[PDB]
RNA sequence: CGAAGGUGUGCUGUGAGGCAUGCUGGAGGUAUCAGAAGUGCGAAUGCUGACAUAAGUAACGAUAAAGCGGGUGAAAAGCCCGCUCGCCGGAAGACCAAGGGUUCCUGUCCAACGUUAAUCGGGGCAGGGUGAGUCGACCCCUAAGGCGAGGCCGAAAGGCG
RNA sequence: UAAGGUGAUAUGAACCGUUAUAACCGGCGAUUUCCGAAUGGGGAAACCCAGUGUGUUUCGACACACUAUCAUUAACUGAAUCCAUAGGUUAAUGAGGCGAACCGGGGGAACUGAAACAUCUAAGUACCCCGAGGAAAAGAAAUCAACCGAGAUUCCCCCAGUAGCGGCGAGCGAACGGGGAGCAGCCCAGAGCCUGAAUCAGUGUGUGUGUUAGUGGAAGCGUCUGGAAAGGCGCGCGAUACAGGGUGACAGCCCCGUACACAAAAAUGCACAUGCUGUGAGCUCGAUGAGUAGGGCGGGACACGUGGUAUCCUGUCUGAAUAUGGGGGGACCAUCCUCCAAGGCUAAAUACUCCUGACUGACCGAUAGUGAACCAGUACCGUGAGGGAAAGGCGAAAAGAAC
């Protein structure tokens, strides 16, 4: 009740989990080390991104 | 003079390791012993 | 280890007594001999160390019982 | 829940001047309150590259806590204690001896 | 295979940003430092598929950590894997 | 409207002691009568910390000695540059293995280490720097020796193989 | 539960959130690198090297799972050796290692005392090892008593520093009997009626009861000193709440609280017809644990040092009767009394604290109390096992001194 993934009871979240470590997590991660200001928060949502798509993963084989 | 101590990191691992003591109950007795007390090196060789 | 495998003695420490009662600790040892038997229900020789007062058991009781009493136990015969 | 809200008109009881009214600012994790125009102080600022670069002696509300600041009556105008009660599990800030809800 | 997409988490820091990096760079080659777990295939693999650009051969050497703490407490830092990334073919620099 | 503690003064009792008060201090003290003791220190070549003495005394670590000009700097015998002079040269030159582990390079600093000063440094603070199919390790193989399935032996542990 | 948060030294930067979905706390999960019993082989801890399968593949290769030893059981193959074993291979189950104290067992000292020392003592103590369990061990008389009787075991107070043992020295030291805590007895050696026939153990629930988050919780103002009031003074109120802690000095009424009342999605510990599954009721007849009791020799334990020494264990050599019978009653014999060894199981009273929570102290207050109030088994010292410190206080609030 205090978290909702209701957008994420979906199938094929292995393409969004894809998107989220490639072309957005490397690129938080080169902008972070080129030097940008709001990247800083958006690397811990996206952190926490792939541990929800992650663990629902876990919880349905189905993908 | 030569001095006591002529270091070589084989012979002292193979002495004082972790392996070393493990091989046998009275090394396994030692680091039980260390373990007890809290040390943060257990094996002074490692 | 000396053990009779069908009594089970094993060795004892006890005390060396002079005359002057002086104190030794001494070992008392059981009498084992490696002897084999024959069975006839296996149709061969079964070798066990055994004790002089272990092959008197065997004498009395029969070596197909002392044989189901060690696999009873679970020692290796 | 916690007597003391995050922008209350409240009066102080203890120190400084007792009689002055403010409202709360922010509350802290530690006991304490900044209420405006109550605590204040003259503080020293050093030179800081890009802002404060020539520093000064200015003013800021200290931290007062949530002891000494108790919450002010419009009614009644005098200091006033918070108690709360409701049946639902949503609660509601009642004054005591006026039987109004904050 | 190629290895995957979800694999190729070697990619850390795309500049090490110093004279000897910007002089190789503006000569022949990219350095980057990447993982610590990084083979030289999977850092060559994964400079070709997340940048465009061609790779001859990468090289790479560990970086051991810094102590850089004073006496009443004591640190190490972290040690670190470079790899000099050459790129000849296919390249805009 | 000033507790315990500290520091002087005055008074008092035979004594250990007590009382009052000026200054410092800025929160405790506990008449009287009982009760329990970690209940009194000058010694133990007593234990711990502080500080004297010798005393501004010995010493500043190979007798391979240095002199000058310029620069920087708050300050130069010691740092940098240059010209002489001297020393080693089967080393006091150069390269590894063991060992150490960042002492290597650059920028800055002089509080502590430099047996003096220090602008300097193997010192403090920040960045850098170690790129291998062929050099070593890893890996193939083995000596001494170690471990040793099963086994033999041994109160237990375990010993040998 | 919530208006505040993104743990601390530690500020910052970018952000999240309304009690209706930030953070915080609790139940159940998900992930859980590598080493470490380490278990695929090795090894100089956190590293090196694989093998067999499944799937993909850009031909460069990638992902995942399994692969240790021993014990038991089953299957398949199988020597000398004809049958058969030993062995080999596979599969299922189980074990390994760690941990402060208590417990049972296997070995077991010496310093010391005797004003020396050897019998003796220290002492079955220290230590080493094996084995568990929440307790362990013991346990339902071949037991004491004395001609009356008691009726398993354990633990406490007496008996009692008595009887006795003792280079009759030093010293060691009971039981009988009494008062208590707690207090239930059963099963096989064998067959029939009897066959879930009570009890007992496992397994999600049902109810009560806690545990692991929580909820509400009374009643003070004015004035003087003071930097600040909780202090002085004056007048009130609550109390099933005057245990305690903090707030600018000492607060019952400022805050957290406390007395009291209430609450658990979910998981769990204790108590019923538990539903089920297994073991197994009750009656009749029959039996009554052989290399055993006992003996000689050598030891050991009983308070008992072999002495007049009964009782228990047995290393060794022997060796009965077998309810027409045997054991004990402290050498031994007769009479008498009492009880059935050579098979087992068993709660409670009992010992202990690595850890969890609440409370308490004529306990300590930084040379004291843990070695450690401070980033302590840390810095240092040693090859190693190992040894092992010193180090607390600004202020109410950094307002931590702009210029």
């Known amino acids: 009740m205090k978290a909702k993934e209701l957008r994420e009871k979906s199938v ?3 393409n969004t989990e894809l998107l989220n470590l490639l072309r ?3 690129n938080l991660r080169m902008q972070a080390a080129s030097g940008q200001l709001q990247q800083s928060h958006l690397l811990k949502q996206v952190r926490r991104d792939v541990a929800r798509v992650k663990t629902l993963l876990n919880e349905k084989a189905g993908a | ?6 270091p070589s990191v084989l012979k002292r691992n193979r002495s004082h390791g972790f392996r070393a003591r493990m091989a046998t109950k009275n090394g396994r007795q030692v680091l039980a012993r260390r373990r007890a007390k809290g040390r943060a090196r257990l094996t002074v060789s490692k | 280890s000396r053990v009779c495998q069908v009594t089970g003695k094993r060795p004892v420490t006890g005390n060396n007594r002079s005359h002057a009662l002086n104190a030794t600790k001494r070992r008392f040892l059981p009498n084992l001999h490696s002897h084999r038997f024959w069975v006839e229900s296996e149709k061969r020789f079964v070798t066990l160390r055994v004790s002089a007062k272990g092959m008197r058991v065997i004498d009395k009781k029969g070596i197909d019982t002392v044989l189901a009493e060690l696999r ?3 020692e290796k015969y | 829940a916690a007597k003391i809200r995050r922008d209350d008109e409240v009066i102080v009881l203890t120190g400084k001047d007792k009689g002055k009214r403010g409202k709360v600012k ?3 994790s530690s006991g304490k309150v900044i209420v405006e125009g109550i605590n ?8 800081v590259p890009a802002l404060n670069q020539p520093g000064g002696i200015v003013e800021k509300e200290a ?5 000494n600041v108790a919450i002010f009556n419009a009614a009644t105008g005098k200091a006033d204690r918070v108690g709360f009660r409701f049946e639902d599990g949503k609660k509601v800030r009642f004054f005591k001896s006026n039987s109004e809800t904050i | 295979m190629i290895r995957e997409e979800r694999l190729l988490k070697v990619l850390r820091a795309p500049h090490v940003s110093e004279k000897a990096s910007t002089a190789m760079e503006k000569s022949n080659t990219i350095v980057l430092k990447v993982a610590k777990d990084a083979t030289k295939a999977e850092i060559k693999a994964a400079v070709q598929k997340l940048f465009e650009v061609e790779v001859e051969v990468v090289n790479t050497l560990v970086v051991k950590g810094k102590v850089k703490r004073h006496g009443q407490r004591i640190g190490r830092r972290s040690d670190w894997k470079k790899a000099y990334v050459t790129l ?6």
């Open chain 1, 24 to 26: 957005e997590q490397f």
């Open chain 4, 40 to 47: 204040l102080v003259k503080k020293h600022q050093k030179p």
């Open chain 1, 12 to 14: 094929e979240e292995l």
């Open chain 4, 63 to 67: 931290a007062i806590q949530v002891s």
């Open chain 5, 88 to 93: 000849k073919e296919g390249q805009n620099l």
């Open chain 3, 72 to 74: 009873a136990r679970g």
């Open chain 2, 1 to 6: 003079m030569k001095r006591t101590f002529q």
């Open chain 4, 26 to 28: 922010n509350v802290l």
